[PDB]
Amino acid sequence: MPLAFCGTENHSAAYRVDQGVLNNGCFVDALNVVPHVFLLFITFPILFIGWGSQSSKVHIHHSTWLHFPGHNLRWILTFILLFVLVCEIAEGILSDGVTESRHLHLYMPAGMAFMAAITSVVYYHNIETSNFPKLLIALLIYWTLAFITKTIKFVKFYDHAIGFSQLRFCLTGLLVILYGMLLLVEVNVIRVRRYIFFKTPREVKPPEDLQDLGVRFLQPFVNLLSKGTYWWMNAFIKTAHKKPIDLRAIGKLPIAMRALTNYQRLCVAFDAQARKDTQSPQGARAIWRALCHAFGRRLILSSTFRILADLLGFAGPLCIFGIVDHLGKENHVFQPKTQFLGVYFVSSQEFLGNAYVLAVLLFLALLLQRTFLQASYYVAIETGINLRGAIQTKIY
Amino acid sequence: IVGVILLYYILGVSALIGAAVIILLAPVQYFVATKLSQAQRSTLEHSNER
């Protein structure tokens, strides 16, 4: 019994190519791995070269950065794609369990896609760090090929009439949507940069505060993941461990957090309020309205992050209750039974009855909840500090 | 509110009563905090005199 990529059942009946090659379930699964392996084979030498250069790079110590348009959109799309691929891995593991053979085609393409997505996001981070937009052609090609393969898989499922009742069909549709969104983001970035066909690209210089060498608070100008995880503070902590922190260590604050800038914004808000409403007295309610109009764009974001964290908080108890309920059945030999073409598709209710799946969902939900809670805390603190500086300047 | 609503389905009326216990005790803690603040003000003025 060797390792067979397709179903070994019925003397390797899954390798038949009759009634059209596209109608074979394993064939499209094998095709979907081609974009992933291509992306790996392209990026691995590039990543190795970048790592080797960084191992002996001195310009990167104070090198600037230029975030591409839709940076947060790209990061959230990558996170959603990773979550969807994890769900696909779980569904494949649940599905192939009933079959005696391994049926590697069910989950190995999903793992390859997961690795490809990780490599692609690392590649995008590297391209953001080193302003070389021309290298995005390979990423665009990978996105197009993955979208084509996923569309072929989706139309094959539609021909087989999987329907929305199948979690595999739903995840395939979600993956198609995510690939399309990533392709649209890449196309928009290329259009903004005008670096492929247009003779004169529209380059963007790094911001002046970032270019300044007296600034060390890199949180505002960082990748989205780095900002969320406070990853840039690791070097600061390492430096603080040996060298005591002094005023020299604390760099100059950026332009966005300037007390003078906050005071000017507050004065602009007050003037706008006075122009809109001709109210001679400056009441407490008027002050509250001015503060709201000045800081809502961050207060609402912090509140939304806190709300998301609170909503994800109940996921813990929900997963615990589900796991205990599933384990409360004396008989555990029973397995989901819903076969369409031998793949044994699993419905939503049957899929949710998996303890490992519930544990993974709980882990991801806790990660997202606590990350959002920390982000909301940071945003609220920054807004309060800016308001305090503006109020102090106004009092002065 | 969301937690209470879901716990109503999870357990029932007893969970609602248990939650209402804490709900009613929260203003009690607020009053205790106010009394603590008054005592702290008295201690602060005495310490300032000292």
Partner: peptide
């Protein structure tokens, strides 16, 4: 604690408004 902080902030805002509505340095423009 949040409610107490909100009440103290309301008192602070009222006091700040009263302070701002006080006398100012006249003839500054001239």
């Amino acid at each position: 604690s949040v409610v107490r902080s909100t009440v103290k902030a309301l008192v602070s805002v009222k006091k700040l408004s009263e302070f701002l509505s006080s006398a100012e340095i006249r003839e500054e423009q001239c």
